[PDB]
Design an enzyme around this catalytic site. Sequence first.
Site, PDB file in Angstrom:
ATOM      1  CB  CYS B  49      -0.807   0.025   1.456  1.00 34.57           C
ATOM      2  SG  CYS B  49      -1.941   1.189   1.269  1.00 34.57           S
ATOM      3  CB  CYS B  51      -2.275   5.949   0.981  1.00 33.00           C
ATOM      4  SG  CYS B  51      -3.497   4.537   1.730  1.00 33.00           S
ATOM      5  CB  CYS B  70      -4.379  -4.127   2.847  1.00 34.16           C
ATOM      6  SG  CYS B  70      -5.845  -3.042   2.937  1.00 34.16           S
TER       7      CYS B  70
END
Lengths: 73, 109
Positions: B49, B51, B70
Site C-alpha cells: 500500500c 498511502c 490488504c
Amino acid sequence: MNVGDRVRVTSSVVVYHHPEHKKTAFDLQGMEGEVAAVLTEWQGRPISANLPVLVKFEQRFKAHFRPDEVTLI
Amino acid sequence: NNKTLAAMKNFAEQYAKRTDTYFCSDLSVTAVVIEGLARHKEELGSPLCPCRHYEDKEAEVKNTFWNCPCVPMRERKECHCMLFLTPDNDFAGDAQDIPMETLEEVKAS
Ligand code: SF4
C-alpha cells in the site's frame, strides 16, 4: 495476550470473507475462537499491521482484529 | 515497469467490480494510488500500500498484511487510500473504471 488464548469478539466487526457469507456483510460479534498469532514483527523487524490479532474460528475461518475488539474468554 | 502500471490499473478496475466498490469521485486520487502501487510493486516485488509510511518496507511485503488488497480491505472492505470506496462513502463517485490517460498524466508529473 497469548497464542492459544480463547477469545470472544466483543466489538461489532463486519467482515466479507466468512465461508458461510462469502462476499456479504457478516458481524462476528459474539463469535468465539482462538488467538493464532499476534503480529508485531516479521523476523525481528517490526511491522505495522493494524489488525494484529489473528483469530481462528470454526469452519476453517480466520479474521484479524485490534486487541480492543476481543476479550479473553 | 509501464507493463506493471497497466497491470495495476486493470487490477484496480477488476477488484472494484468484484467487491461492489467504487473509485473516488476525483479520479486523480485514484490514479495517484494506482501509480504508487505499481512503483512499490516494481521496487519491492509486491504492491505494498502506497498511502502509508513504514519502518521496514521489505519486512512489510514479507509479512503481507499491507500488500494490495490488504487485510482490512479483504476482510472489512476498508481502504484507507480511498482507492476502493463503498457506495455509501461521501467520496465515492460512480466509476469502476479509470481512463488510462488519467494515469499517464500522473506519470507526466
Ligand atoms: S488501503 Fe488496502 S486496498 Fe486500499 S490501496 Fe492500500 S493496500 Fe490497497
